[PDB]
């Protein structure tokens, strides 16, 4: 829950949920690139995925 002062304009509340977001990038041969992304607290939703 949050308590914000009343304001006449429509406003948004931006909550950043701090996580890890690490990428590992491997090129195992010439002209081959591979990338794998991990995000751990959000993986089952609230992450677009």
């Amino acid at each position: 829950n949050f308590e914000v002062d009343p304001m006449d304009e429509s406003t948004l509340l931006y909550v950043v949920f701090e996580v890890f977001d690490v990428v590992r990038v491997h090129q195992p041969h010439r002209g081959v690139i591979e990338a794998v992304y991990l995000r751990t607290p959000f993986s089952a939703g609230n992450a677009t995925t």
Binding site: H29, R30, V32
Partner: protein, 50 residues
């Protein structure tokens, strides 16, 4: 395949072919094929059979 091109070469980097099966191929058209990596395709202006 560019428009009015009569050749498209493919080069695949050197990698294993362990447990490889056949190939298949067919030709499509650029205007009729959207990408599946993208959530929206602004350039896809076709609604016929894909």
């Amino acid at each position: 395949i560019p428009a009015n091109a009569t050749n498209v070469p493919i080069s695949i980097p050197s990698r294993n072919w362990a447990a490889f099966r056949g190939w298949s191929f067919t030709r499509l058209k650029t205007k009729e094929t959207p990408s599946l990596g993208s959530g929206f395709d602004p350039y896809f202006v076709y609604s016929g059979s894909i």
